[PDB]
Subunit: 406 residues, 4 copies
């Protein structure tokens, strides 16, 4: 039973018996020489396999599959247990890319995603049908930074015999271990905080090994004709789901992570606890600064007294409810734009989860094509600025924003 | 108007206005500051487009992803694709299992029988799909003939050109509308990087069978692709919808490494087919070899189609069968010192596999032969080694086999 | 005036005007297209240039040249101001690679290095001649972890008109800024703590711009015939030394850093303050644990009350005197070897400065070919174990060593 | 006993017993656990050794470092080297400035005059140094003749073979004892990675002039190199002393990228000299061209030496001079669209420079000509583009020049 800081440094890392190299070698190879039939009768990469086993260990899961992106990890997590004609219940407060994946791309493939408001538990239960195969929520939703009641939602999932999937991108295992709170599957965009340096697009699917695969999931308990009548729950025990994801979806769609990307993401995971503790300390200080400023109208961060999600922050995310929060300057839309155009240290771009501090005015950029009614419905107000708080000196971040506010 | 060797080295490559670097910088970044795609990857997309005579291309994380994207861009649950039975094992499973689960029924036809294609097409069919050189029979389909059958029914002709590359065959010149590659193989050429790509000709006029291309897309703010992008509608939809939503994107580093391979494509591919033909000949005359299946051998069913569609040489992959059966094959596999025993093809290095004692051992002798795998079949991917050393290595192995 | 944490993240990083990429692009290129004569009439790489400017900023210097290794950085730092027939005064308590460079490789090139005992200041002064061109010391010497009196040694250097060069590899700018204490040139093996992940061999030379180049350094104040009578102190102002190092030694010997290596080292520098604070907190706790253990004879770490360098730790290295220290188990040579062979978390290898914890018994490995008299003279005792304390959980490192001790 | 194309692809490359990966893994590590060098870099060292017929090689961070190491391994303060005057500008400055400061006097001789070599040798001389194809005159020295002069005086013959590579010339077959390369150039071939290498023949018997090789080394625990390593004494000393002490080591990543280039060396280098010769011919007949200097042109002073030492083609670099002087040269440089204006050579891409208006503009017309740079001299590095496109680009540029 090693601590978090040991595990983020060492977990899944065997020493190569050829060279004995201390660093993980970059196995930039398409293929491997055979001993051959027993390999195919029962793919992967040895660099990636370290990152896979490391994330599994940090979340306390049985195994993981890395993918080329967060988007591909989400796609794979659903398509592994949902076929044409099936349904998924999802929180409405999703990442834009997740919404369009769910509402459009998947809908065309015959998977119907029913969006509910995650603050209302009755709405989850009321949306479940015979066809429903999973409940999906984000740890901290977009763009509102809402925290769902994980245990309550998990009780609903399990009562109906479906898995609970949590996208934990905004927190990482350092701030929240969804499997400790009823989650059966965890997904990340490792592109964001897990990777940490804005270098490498990557995703991963983590299986708890805690879900009893039932008659609602026949492809997991019945002969697979692609592997000559292999039963995943017989051959792979509690790891049936993640084995099937590798052997079917990674084999067939091939959203695979380059070993070079796995390598770079591992450099980030090596410092995860250190980066994430600095992220949250900086976010809370900057949130408390803006929430007392005369040029600021409102601040939306769960750790601020009065926020609807304050009691859910203290229960589920005691170390800090991520490092992303929104605020509204006084002066509306035109004031927000002046702030974007006057910051010198915050970087103006659409992404979150870099070591560097990030700013965006979604109403003047990402959401500019939509009406204000459409923007408000999507959780975007005219004055709303989103911060992704990096690991710079907090005095420099306060100075930069305070200077723009003036 | 530049020639193949110039484009393979220069096409899609701008000089950066910051540094003016002559090499393609590796933009290993997640994000860009404001005043989708990647500038390293962009060079490779334009380069493959230019080499095939296409209007544009989208890079993917694998050939498998390129094929998936290429179909999913124009087919949804309840639609159909007509594909050749002669598919790489991974394409067959994608089509017959994964796309089936997504409610897309793929109808398999014997690509020797042009009529078998016309029969398989229905109202709901959205494309015809074939490989230039089929797995594992090394069969050349009648492209022009199949393209006419597709165009008669107002649907695109999709060609997997992995085994040929644009140097040996440009499917667009012979009626293909979309071209897909596993760049993992010969385009890459060095066995380092897994990559795919979809290439749009921009020749096909999209109709009422492809509504998401001619009608407004809710997915991208009520935009019409044919209106905004003209002949580039298909490749734009693929990027803006599937590459965004499913995100099977290619590493900038992998793009860098595939570009390095593409700079020598004409050079490598010429040596490949020069080595492949000499070795195919050698084995065809050897008294311990029962049969060799390579279309450039006189008597092969696909010789005229080689001389027509693939005059420079019909790829560098062929299947030979030793007198001696499974045992002889196993013995040759276990005795080669230069040929590398693995499951991939398309490396600069010569590769060998005996599917019957490896990949296809779980199937019965009957189930094997039903998938076009003979018990005695050895597949070769012929590398750019000295042909004398390759002949010697195989001849040395053949001398450990009985008569 | 930005803080350390901002500078380690942002310093030297311009946004590319082509792509606007937030991450530093890897410019893996041998050459660049011309506008051409004015370029050569007045080389480098744009990825490396970020790392160069970043380290200069963290040390408060005027500029830096990255090299292929710490060894090449030291070679370049001496050869830039010392020719055949010249001399250097160096502390005896040097890295093995530095000693052999100084005693053998350089001696053959006609540069005579006079070794003094750095604890005795009179010995520095007594070793200086008309031919002497520099004093060289390590921040924390090998293998004894000795701290020189930087200011006192710097007063001696400057009294005689020679620069003071400090190898700061074991501390990094987070724990010690040698230029604040009289140093004119700083060198690092970025291979070690600066890089932080045991991935990339790299070195760097940092010029203070604070040394008035005098008649003892004619190549810096007189026409250079290689650049058609260019005078470095005229053309490059206070940056004469580092400009000459680039234009002569990097051009002629070509110990250049791959842009890929510069990239990876920058990923490490991004988290330098966070990694180094964890390194020192872990080292002090493990040092205090061993220094009170009944199975341990002695512990040599400056931060322990009683150590000769305790008063010099508190003055020069208040945050913590690096993360490398030696100890002697009771039971001598054979006990030390049992410890090496029984640790499961500490990695057995010759290097220092990884995120991972490192152990070596120099008398049974690195120094095995030498006599005990020869070993003792080199500062190696039979029982001496060297630890490089990583950033794992301190409970796991204590458990691992405590288990071996038993 | 394998041929060049097989070795360039396979030599020095083991299958890893952990993963059995077919590609050379990138061992981007500082350190290794106990039960100097790098296993990625090791493959490249053995591969270049095998290609030249050498006993071993040491990779360096640059050609400049390889040359430095190669000299410093057998010379110290107070010694001498005899080098050709015809050196790449960087070698000249290393020799005449940096090595001078380290008390090593380099004596420069006109390599056309075999006698000028014998005169320059003294008691204190430790090597003879030349480039296969000199800069910028493209002169071929009489290797065998110079090797005899070196061996008569009991000193090694060192050849910079950067411009040829082992495919076009193996200096060891013509009397060289040490071979150095800038792998940055043609060995690399893709303009991505700066790298050098020293190759030891193991043919030279070290004598009392080289004491640190025949006597005990204090530096490495009183070991004698000739006793412990036999014929590999020189290359072992270089690794164990200079690579350790000065640490100009090659990135494992750079080693990976140079290996990818070396896999196609025979293929690229053949196209280079096929393009170089056609274009040299074209310019030699063009009425706006006064002179072309390439040894494969009949009438050139080095034609017989080409036909002897370099039958496949005397590299792909040559100097031409337009009728019109400095101005015409500047005009051609400013009008080319395919040739890239930069200071390097040895890329797959065609390169051009006009040293007189660029690298050598600070010198007077007199000081230029003294360094073998004519005011009208244009140097070309001829790439692997279609020769038609290269001819066209130059002809197009020549049509913006007056008569």
């Amino acid at each position: 039973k090693y601590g978090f800081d040991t595990l983020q440094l060492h977990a899944g890392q065997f020493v190569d018996r050829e060279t004995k190299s201390r660093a993980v070698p970059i196995y930039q190879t398409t293929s491997y020489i055979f001993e051959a039939a027993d390999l195919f009768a029962l793919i992967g990469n040895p660099t990636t396999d370290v990152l896979e086993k490391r994330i599994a260990a940090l979340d306390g899961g049985v195994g993981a599959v890395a993918t080329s992106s967060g988007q591909a990890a989400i796609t794979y997590a659903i398509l592994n247990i949902a076929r044409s004609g099936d349904e998924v219940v999802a929180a409405s407060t999703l990442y834009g890319g997740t919404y369009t994946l769910f509402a459009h791309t998947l809908r065309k493939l015959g998977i119907t995603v029913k969006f509910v408001n995650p603050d209302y538990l009755e709405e989850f239960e009321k949306a479940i049908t015979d066809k429903t195969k999973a409940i999906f929520v984000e740890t901290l939703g977009n763009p509102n930074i809402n925290i769902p009641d994980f245990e309550a939602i998990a009780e609903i999932a399990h009562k109906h015999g479906i898995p609970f999937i949590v996208d934990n991108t905004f927190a990482t295992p350092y701030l929240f271990r969804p499997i400790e709170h009823g989650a059966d599957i965890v997904v990340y965009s490792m592109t964001k905080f897990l990777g940490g340096h804005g270098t490498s697009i990557a995703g991963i699917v983590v299986d708890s090994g805690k879900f009893e695969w039932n008659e609602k999931f026949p492809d997991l308990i019945q002969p697979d004709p692609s592997y000559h009548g292999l039963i995943y729950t017989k051959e792979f025990g509690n790891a049936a789901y993640i084995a099937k994801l590798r052997l079917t979806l990674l084999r067939d769609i091939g959203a695979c992570l380059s070993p070079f990307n796995s390598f770079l993401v591992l450099l980030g995971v090596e410092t995860l606890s250190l980066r994430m503790q600095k992220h949250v300390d900086n976010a809370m200080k900057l949130a408390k600064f803006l929430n007392d400023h005369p040029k600021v109208e409102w601040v939306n961060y769960p750790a601020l007294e009065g926020n609807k999600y304050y009691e859910l922050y203290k229960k589920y995310l005691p170390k800090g409810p991520g490092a992303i929060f929104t605020f509204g300057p006084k002066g509306g839309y035109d004031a927000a734009k002046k702030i974007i155009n006057n910051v010198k240290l915050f970087s103006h771009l659409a992404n979150v989860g870099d070591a560097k501090s990030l700013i965006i005015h979604p109403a003047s950029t990402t959401h500019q094509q939509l009406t204000e009614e459409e923007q408000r419905a999507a959780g975007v107000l005219p004055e709303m600025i989103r911060l992704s708080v990096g690991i710079e000196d907090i005095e420099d971040l306060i100075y930069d924003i305070e200077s723009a506010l003036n």
